[PDB]
């Protein structure tokens, strides 16, 4: 029982040791920068062909190919430039909640309520796409899967544990324990040596891939966390929640920097993505319009309102040319 | 115009044709979601139907293909994955009548029924409710009074009144009584009765949906 109060003191110690470094808020630091207040984005392509809701999309490293997952049991690789379809992968489990596209472009990943992450081999001697490994070992449902490299994939489940897998062996290599609730999102640093996982416990945790230990813990959200994304520098990450609030945390400072909130928004956030420069924060919303937040000043530069139903998956290309927003209406839109 | 991407366009159109045909095949099947608290009821009802994640069972009755998604094994927060089943034709809910005295179980089943019935994703989804363990309820009701589970009950400890009271209690949870119909049935040892009841309910839901789209409702 003595441990409970001693831990409480340590929590107080963290707050005091971190209250000290909070000399000023970033709102004051950037009160003098020019506002980027004219961001009008028009739909450029309308990827069409899904027959049910879309829950995840991921861009390729080449900034042209994108993969979209849907509840109809199909994975489509789209050529963004010409609207063409490169492949149609029929999934074994129609319940897919995440999709990842390997950086090399050889493989794609999908997962969902089946509790299995499937790795597909895009480039084979035969013309069809085949499944290479069926990863198993999670009791809960898979929320997000991301590829560290051609052979290693990191995955988050709904049983409070995020895991890292070796594709060739098919066996779990490191287990990241410590969350008290369902984990919903994973974002990998540009160096691919750290990743941040956000859970339903309203806390975001920074892990280390090599040692499997929680390096830092961040809190401040009233409710669940649904999306997480790193800033390009890799020294900050933004998080989305169901209380209509986005926050920017710092890995080094250990504290909140800005709160992205507006009174008119009372809906949850389903996707958060950053722009190539880091000056635009693209946050998906359940009001049927994704919103472009200026990261440094917390003001809404612009709105994208081309969605019939709720925005679900949003991604920014590596080259920064386009922002693709998937939605439950079964249509993807490429917004430049 | 184009040089080698014309073949790519042909590939895209062929892929679109395959997806449309697959979508038609999927749309033909009727999807049912199975929920409950006691695993015994789920196992019995699944076995009665003609025949580690969520289990999908396929059975065909009267040339109508069915899909049943058992999500019992998924131990997680239900709110974050329940929305994936927004379009299901009907929800099959199983409750054990023999669990009224065992432990608070009946209260837990009522709580789950209230949670899913009034959820914002299933406003217009009919809920089929199966009360299992009828024979055990017959045997137990003679000795243990139904007063233990519901203090307010004032009735004879007989099967007909107790069963009617429990059904009335469960059917009273739906706050929205206009757009949703809670069909109730007591499970029978024969598989035929259960499958026929499910077929009647799903056909009624199909007719109601077709009328709703065409404006008559």
């Amino acid at each position, epitope marked *: 029982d003595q441990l409970r109060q001693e831990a409480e003191q340590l929590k107080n110690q963290i707050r005091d040791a971190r209250k000290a470094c909070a000399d000023a808020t970033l709102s004051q630091i950037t009160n003098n920068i020019d506002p980027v207040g004219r961001i009008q984005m028009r739909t450029r392509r309308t990827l069409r062909g899904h027959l049910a809701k879309i829950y995840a999309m991921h861009w390729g490293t080449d900034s042209r190919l994108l993969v979209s997952a849907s509840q109809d049991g199909k994975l489509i690789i789209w050529d963004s430039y010409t609207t063409n379809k490169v492949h149609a992968i029929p999934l074994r489990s129609s319940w897919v909640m995440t999709c990842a596209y390997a950086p090399s472009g050889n493989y794609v990943a999908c997962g969902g309520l089946d509790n299995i992450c499937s790795i597909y081999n895009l480039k084979t001697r035969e*013309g069809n796409v085949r499944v290479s490994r069926e990863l198993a070992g999670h009791t809960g449902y898979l929320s997000c899967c991301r590829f560290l490299d051609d052979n290693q994939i990191v995955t988050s489940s709904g049983d409070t544990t995020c895991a890292l897998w070796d594709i060739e062996t098919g066996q779990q290599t490191t287990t990241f324990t410590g969350h008290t609730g369902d984990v919903m999102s994973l974002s990998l640093a540009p160096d691919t040596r750290l990743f941040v996982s956000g859970a339903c416990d309203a806390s975001a945790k920074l892990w280390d891939v090599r040692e499997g230990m929680c390096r830092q813990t961040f809190t401040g959200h009233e409710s669940d966390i649904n999306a997480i994304c790193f800033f390009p520098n890799g020294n900050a990450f933004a998080t989305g929640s169901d209380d209509a609030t986005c926050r920017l945390f710092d890995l080094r400072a250990d504290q909140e920097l800005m709160t992205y909130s507006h009174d008119n928004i009372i809906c949850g956030i389903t996707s958060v993505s950053f722009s190539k420069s880091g000056r635009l924060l693209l946050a998906g919303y359940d009001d049927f319009n994704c919103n472009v937040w200026d990261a440094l000043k917390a003001d809404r530069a612009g709105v994208l309102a081309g969605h019939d139903n709720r925005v679900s998956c949003l991604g920014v290309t590596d080259d920064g040319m386009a922002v693709a927003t998937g939605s439950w209406d079964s249509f993807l839109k490429i917004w430049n | 115009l184009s040089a080698e991407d*014309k*073949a790519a366009v042909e590939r895209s159109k*062929m892929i679109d044709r395959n997806l449309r045909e697959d979508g038609e095949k999927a749309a033909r099947e009727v999807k049912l979601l199975l929920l409950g608290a006691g695993e015994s009821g789920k196992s019995t009802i699944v076995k009665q139907m003609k025949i580690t994640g969520i289990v999908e069972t396929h059975f065909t009755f009267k040339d109508l293909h069915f899909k049943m998604f058992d999500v019992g094994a998924q131990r997680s927060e239900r709110k974050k994955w329940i929305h994936c089943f927004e379009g299901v034709t009907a929800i099959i809910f199983c409750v054990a009548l023999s669990d009224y005295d065992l432990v608070n179980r009946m209260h837990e089943s009522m709580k789950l029924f209230d949670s899913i019935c009034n959820n914002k994703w299933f406003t217009d989804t009919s809920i089929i409710l199966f009360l299992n363990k009828k024979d055990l309820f017959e045997e137990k009701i003679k000795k243990s009074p139904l007063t233990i589970c519901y203090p307010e009950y004032a009735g004879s400890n007989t099967y007909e009144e107790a069963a009617a009271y429990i059904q009335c209690q469960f059917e009273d949870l739906n706050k929205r009584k206009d757009t949703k119909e809670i069909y109730t049935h007591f499970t029978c040892s024969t598989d035929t009765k259960n499958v026929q009841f499910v077929f009647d309910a799903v056909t009624d839901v199909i007719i109601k949906n077709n009328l709703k789209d065409c404006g008559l409702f």
Partner: single-chain antibody
Amino acid sequence: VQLVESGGGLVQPGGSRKLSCSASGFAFSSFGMHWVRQAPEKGLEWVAYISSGSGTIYYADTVKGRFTISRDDPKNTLFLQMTSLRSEDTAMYYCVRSIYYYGSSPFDFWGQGTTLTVSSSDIVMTQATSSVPVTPGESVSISCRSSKSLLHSNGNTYLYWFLQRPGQSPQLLIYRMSNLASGVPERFSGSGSGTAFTLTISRLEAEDVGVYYCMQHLEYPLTFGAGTKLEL
């Protein structure tokens, strides 16, 4: 992945014959299938092309109207119907598979081919040299010229390179002028600007000897180069 062809034999002039190619080891339905013939002691020339789904069929001008190409996807076989055979049609007919999508490698696999013997506008592609003296361990370059610029608006130059070892089917080396095919050693390298093209072998070995070919895929009919032979 193997393609074995059938139907080759002596045919009297003016007759008919049907060539059959059976495919095993890959998804035939999703691959476009080509027919390429090689006259004895001569270069390659395109004959026909049937796309996936039988939607689009193209024929070469020499054999237009008298040749019929058809595919039976359920049985995984490709059919070439030959009518009114003439002396010019004596050649070894090769069967090639091509799939077209972004990043694809067309003409990756070539069948063994069968010999057919008959008894007694287009983009020209020119290879300057018939033969070049080459010795093992030395870099060499093969040149290729085209009548019309091959750089399409997309930004892709539709040039393909091929190697035919003596007594074997042609094999793909470089596709789209800069991309190495699967299974080809890195020593092969290709570069081109506008119409002038070059293929470079950094270090040559015994297997590299053979006749090299050029292909253009910008427009139909597809045309091949005369053929550059490397001998040790």
